[PDB]
């Protein structure tokens, strides 16, 4: 059974809402496990208190940089980086959850939630989950993004874990 994780989102510290995700452990078990464990904080680090540092409306919302809070950091449960596990799953539409990276085999902790079909990312970013509840909360987060991704308010993961 594929695991479910949730994030409770806040805007300048004001609760916004919860987003849950199905993680496709059946297809990308290593990548799904990294995200799952970073969501639970079970290795002693992870997403709780981290921010969505890059939000581009009509494209995606990016976060998971829990070390440097700006797109230059993050780490996996396996080490600083791990390989692209596979590209079975494609960027089919809004709600897809996919790994951000800095080129091949550079997955750490950074992720994005698509708010459009982004097929040009097929075979360059590892798709590992989708939004199951709260896509409306992801849609609301776009109210605080910009063309270049800079956010107009501080968007944080106030709480996260496994359902």
């Amino acid at each position: 059974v594929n695991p479910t994780v949730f994030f409770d989102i806040a805007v300048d510290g004001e609760p916004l809402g919860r987003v849950s995700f199905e993680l496709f452990a059946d297809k990308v078990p290593k990548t799904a496990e990294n995200f799952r464990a970073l969501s639970t904080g079970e290795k002693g680090f992870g997403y709780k208190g981290s921010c969505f540092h890059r939000i581009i409306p009509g494209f995606m919302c990016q976060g998971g940089d829990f070390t440097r809070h700006n797109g230059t950091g993050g780490k996996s449960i396996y080490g600083e980086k791990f390989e692209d596990e596979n590209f079975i799953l494609k960027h089919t539409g809004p709600g897809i959850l996919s790994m951000a990276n800095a080129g091949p085999n550079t997955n750490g902790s950074q992720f994005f939630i698509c708010t459009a079909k982004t097929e040009w990312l097929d075979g360059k970013h590892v798709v590992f989950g989708k939004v199951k509840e709260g896509m409306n909360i992801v849609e609301a987060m776009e109210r605080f993004g910009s063309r270049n991704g800079k956010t107009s308010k501080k968007i944080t993961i106030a709480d996260c874990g496994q359902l």
Binding site: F59, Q62, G71, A102, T118, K124
Partner: peptide, 8 residues
């Protein structure tokens, strides 16, 4: 600085 993923 051109963070990935890149838009189209």
């Amino acid at each position: 600085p051109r963070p990935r993923p890149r838009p189209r």
